[PDB]
Amino acid sequence: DMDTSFVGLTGGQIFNEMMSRQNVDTVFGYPGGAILPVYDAIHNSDKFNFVLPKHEQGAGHMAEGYARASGKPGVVLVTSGPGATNVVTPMADAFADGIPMVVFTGQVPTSAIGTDAFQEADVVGISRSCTKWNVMVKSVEELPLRINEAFEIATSGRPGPVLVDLPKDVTAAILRNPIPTKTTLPSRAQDEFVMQSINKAADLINLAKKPVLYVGAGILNHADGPRLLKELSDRAQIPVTTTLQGLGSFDQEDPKSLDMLGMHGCATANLAVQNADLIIAVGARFDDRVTGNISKFAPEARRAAAEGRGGIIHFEVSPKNINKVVQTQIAVEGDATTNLGKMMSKIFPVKERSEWFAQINKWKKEYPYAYMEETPGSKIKPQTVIKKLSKVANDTGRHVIVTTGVGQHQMWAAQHWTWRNPHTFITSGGLGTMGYGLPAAIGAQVAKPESLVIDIDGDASFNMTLTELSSAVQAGTPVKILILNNEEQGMVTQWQSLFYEHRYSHTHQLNPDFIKLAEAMGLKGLRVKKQEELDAKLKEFVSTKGPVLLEVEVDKKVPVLPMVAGGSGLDEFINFDPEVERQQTELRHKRTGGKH
Amino acid sequence: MDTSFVGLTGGQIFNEMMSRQNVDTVFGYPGGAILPVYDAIHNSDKFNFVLPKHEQGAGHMAEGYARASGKPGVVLVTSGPGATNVVTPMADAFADGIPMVVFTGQVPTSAIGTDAFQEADVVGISRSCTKWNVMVKSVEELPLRINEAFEIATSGRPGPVLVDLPKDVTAAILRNPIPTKTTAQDEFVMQSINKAADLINLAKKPVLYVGAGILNHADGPRLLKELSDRAQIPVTTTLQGLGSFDQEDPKSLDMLGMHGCATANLAVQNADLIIAVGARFDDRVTGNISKFAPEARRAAAEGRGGIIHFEVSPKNINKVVQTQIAVEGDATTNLGKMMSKIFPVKERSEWFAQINKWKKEYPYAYMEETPGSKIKPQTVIKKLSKVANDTGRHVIVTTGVGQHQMWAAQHWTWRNPHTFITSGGLGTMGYGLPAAIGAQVAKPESLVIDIDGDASFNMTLTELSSAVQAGTPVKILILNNEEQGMVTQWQSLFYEHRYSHTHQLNPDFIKLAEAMGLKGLRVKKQEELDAKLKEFVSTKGPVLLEVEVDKKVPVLPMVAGGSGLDEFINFDPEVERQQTELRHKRTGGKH
């Protein structure tokens, strides 16, 4: 069966048509020679909104933030050569964090490919290891097919980035042949096997006496995910901890909430996991930033497994991540949410778990997120800023979205914010890309025009992509940019303090005047130094109509705690100790000859 | 066998190896995976360290450094996003043949292949944009790999290499001694030299087609000048060859190609012999390849001329155009060997008469200022060229990518080697500022000027604060036409003035400069331009000058479409006015 409707159109014009057929409402991009035939076709197009950054990396991270906030794939449209190489970091970032993204790169004409042409890059080769799939379109005839395959692959299984390489002669060419209609249009034994494993997992859960739900980003890839998670938690009385990327999937005000686990997770979550007889892993991949020393990980679960009375259940959509890190007793293949729904009726309702929750509540009382609080004459504490802003933003009654950079401010945002809503924490976790914060916020704001979007950023992170401030003005995105300025690459100085005897090698970048910068870029700029002005400034920050930057001068050389590092198990975290911090301050002064 | 490194960590070995390689500057940004190296180079007296805001900045700085100094640029970044952020500079250095050694931290070997935190397949990603790369797998082979890297980056055609450094390798202590070392065809060439000298002595209308290759040797420009003087041969250069020949010399043809001087293009098309020296016949130079140099091909068919190619990389020989004589190896070296076999020529009356008539007929014409009109971008280049030269200082110029780049290339008078540093092959916007910073580090006493575009500058403007921290008093000139000029030109020409997303919203560049810690200057009026240009150059410390220039001004001449070099579009004042009215009509008076 053939389709003749695209006959007579250029490749560019076909691209434009395929965007509305693929339900694309937003395109992030930057023009150039190779991709000019497509840009002429989308000129003044009302199929979608176009967002123009200052740098293609910005386009990439914007599309990511857009994808995370909307649940739709982020679409990028850039030129060949430097245009394409400039989106390599965002693709690798989306690949690590499972973000659906379709990247369209212009390419030199097919006759010039492989001749080391002007602005030619081997983009398909470069991006092979950091995309789910990529392809070079070699004729206009196969353009709709490739577009359809790209979007499907990007949004199925574990979502991820795909790249489509678009030769200039292909997008300029007129389609002069009918093409298969199928290319233009966007097992019983397996089901029985999945159900079998679902039955097995239900049996294990009904047996557990100290279960823990270990929840990650996977639960958020379905609209009903958080809802079914809660239903399972309430039905079987199971406490819930989340990874960094699962934050927002569970109401942290709920008594059964364990908060975040891992390297910088809540001690209670870490201890609960270390003492659980059953770990129910839902959409999480057991990264070492979560597990700590893997040989020390979940000893009570391993003991339960050896005695046939527990262990680890894994709801995982990708075969690649099953039995990858941890020996699992039961793997439940496919969409976590879907499989939770199927399992629910098989779970015995539990009245209470007195002993287990008594232990957990005692851990909660003993190990809060403690830190050195403000004293007279001291600088503002970064942890205090997060706690205050969390309440201020939440009290607005608006839907709040938070993006971050990478480092200490990121962890403190994760810890001290109170998470309650799905798809409201957007942070770079796997690749951990500095500079993510501002463009991701712009993207998220585009996805959710009514939401209050806050970028909680670091000074070093913000410097990476700060040129996109003007892009926010041009895009009409009233993002709220918060800079926790400690005048350092804090996460690195933390590691240098701990393991390199306070040798701070090249970890202090010279910052610009962030307030003058913001105003030069066309935003309102605010600064706070004094403890007494923090409250009022935070309120003015959140209340501002347009885009606004607020720089908070915060204290320096403050470690993120708790911390699981070295060969420590999850239950061998370093805890906050006020006397230790004081001793570290003296030691630091002496070792740095008074410089820090 | 050598024991001098026994007891040192991999990072400490790296520190010593930089000294042994004669490295005086490292560009980089720290992170988890590369931490053991940064600890070892902490307060190192063996080299200076330059810290950017972005790894792309580090990369382009290293490029600018390499191009001004003649030494390889050294980059030191962390794993994952640190490494992926230097892909564009590597592709840039690969395209332009710039010596660069990139050191990327990597996750511990025990975590490689497990999709670990901040893990990327950097060896895989960078394969197509490096001459060579490697992952160091033990501390014992670290000196060997460092030595290989520097050797490969600086030999043949120079280019980028990458060395992946697993954290556990750089933290590991060398326990065992390592081999001290790790710490016929010339006749075929001589025959070619003889044959090429025979062709040259026979040529009646020869042209020296000179590129970046002649600048990869200290004595390149000198031997080029000698050959040109000896045989009375006119010299044209590529964009990347600018500075290798004195453009004030009567035999200068200026730049050839897509936006080259018409005289240069016409000489090439009418030459009976083309002597290609360190140039790779890119289509930005040749135009339509089937129309390129018809008289040279004709001479070749009659055995009285053709094309001679002095090229160091065999794969670039007969890659684009069929050549009669190939001389493999370093161009400068082979020019020296050839010199004694070239008959001296007193004069070429007819050939230079024809050339000098073209020069009079086809200068770099453009619509000049009129009372009330905006400042013309071409005029700024001419005036700045004189003002900068009048300082008596050594001047180095970097640019961004676009119209300003071409106008810089055209209207500047190039006389000194390694003084024009621009992204040619990859054509990376945002190149100008970080390249200028790196060049200033290489040549602290030089006057370094970034002639940048507004769109290009926006790409990497965050490095302005890095200029302050590095102590590099760069001079930043922004030709502000409030547009992606080179793209709007192509849209005006080929897409009926449909300007699709080619107008980015600029920040206040002066307030930006001041926020970054620089002095900011702005010119709007013609009357202020001269004074502002002089203040700009005479300013001590880093300074930005924004010039509001006229918009929608095409770079001419232009060879595009299926045109041959002699089929260029030339400037015409009446055509420009007609284009202005047509553009107004089609954009509803918006442009």
Ligand SMILES: Cc1cc2nc3c(=O)[nH]c(=O)nc-3n(C[C@H](O)[C@H](O)[C@H](O)COP(=O)(O)OP(=O)(O)OC[C@H]3O[C@@H](n4cnc5c(N)ncnc54)[C@H](O)[C@@H]3O)c2cc1C
């Ligand atoms: C400075 C820093 C510190 C960090 N410290 C911590 C920390 O203390 N604690 C922490 O948790 N993280 C931390 N990380 C982040 C960490 O590196 C990982 O990014 C994070 O642990 C991964 O979370 P995740 O497994 O839930 O999400 P992902 O990496 O996205 O993995 C999701 C898993 O679920 C699967 N999946 C996806 N969709 C579905 C579906 N529909 N159905 C079923 N399965 C699905 C995926 O295939 C994948 O296996 C830190 C990062 C940084 C930069």
Ligand SMILES: Cc1cc2nc3c(=O)[nH]c(=O)nc-3n(C[C@H](O)[C@H](O)[C@H](O)COP(=O)(O)OP(=O)(O)OC[C@H]3O[C@@H](n4cnc5c(N)ncnc54)[C@H](O)[C@@H]3O)c2cc1C
């Ligand atoms: C907007 C724009 C417009 C442009 N328009 C033009 C234009 O009009 N004219 C123009 O010329 N360029 C133009 N370019 C630049 C063009 O794309 C190429 O960068 C340039 O033409 C290549 O110059 P090159 O061959 O001299 O140097 P390279 O690309 O570096 O090639 C040098 C050649 O010499 C060889 N070589 C290197 N070292 C040695 C040695 N020691 N001995 C012998 N051989 C050696 C190399 O292997 C290579 O083959 C433009 C770029 C842009 C962004």
Ligand SMILES: COc1cnc(OC)n2nc(NS(=O)(=O)c3c(OCC(F)F)cccc3C(F)(F)F)nc12
């Ligand atoms: C704004 O668009 C351009 C600006 N400058 C340019 O060259 C310096 N080009 N060149 C093109 N197109 S191109 O000329 O067809 C071409 C190209 O030309 C081959 C063809 F002429 F044989 C070769 C490689 C790349 C490109 C590219 F990416 F730019 F499309 N578009 C522009």
Ligand SMILES: COc1cnc(OC)n2nc(NS(=O)(=O)c3c(OCC(F)F)cccc3C(F)(F)F)nc12
């Ligand atoms: C400033 O340094 C760090 C900041 N934050 C970190 O984790 C969130 N890490 N982690 C490390 N080193 S690491 O822990 O040995 C490690 C790593 O751990 C392996 C080991 F724990 F088994 C795995 C992959 C990458 C890294 C890397 F690159 F960061 F070094 N350094 C930092």
Ligand SMILES: Cc1ncc(C[n+]2c([C@@](C)(O)OO)sc(CCOP(=O)(O)OP(=O)(O)O)c2C)c(N)n1
């Ligand atoms: C990373 C990157 N992205 C896009 C690019 C595609 N290009 C260009 C080109 C010629 O390479 O077209 O292929 S030039 C250009 C815009 C130039 O704006 P300007 O700086 O203001 O200078 P002007 O004086 O106005 O001309 C773009 C968008 C590029 N090279 N790099």
Ligand SMILES: C/C(NCc1cnc(C)nc1N)=C(/S)CCOP(=O)([O-])OP(=O)([O-])O
């Ligand atoms: C350099 C670095 N890590 C390595 C690194 C390097 N380069 C990039 C692109 N990304 C990362 N993550 C960090 S965490 C910097 C943190 O500084 P910050 O922005 O100001 O945050 P904070 O100070 O609060 O920890």
Ligand SMILES: [Mg+2]
């Ligand atoms: Mg900081």
Ligand SMILES: [Mg+2]
């Ligand atoms: Mg411009």
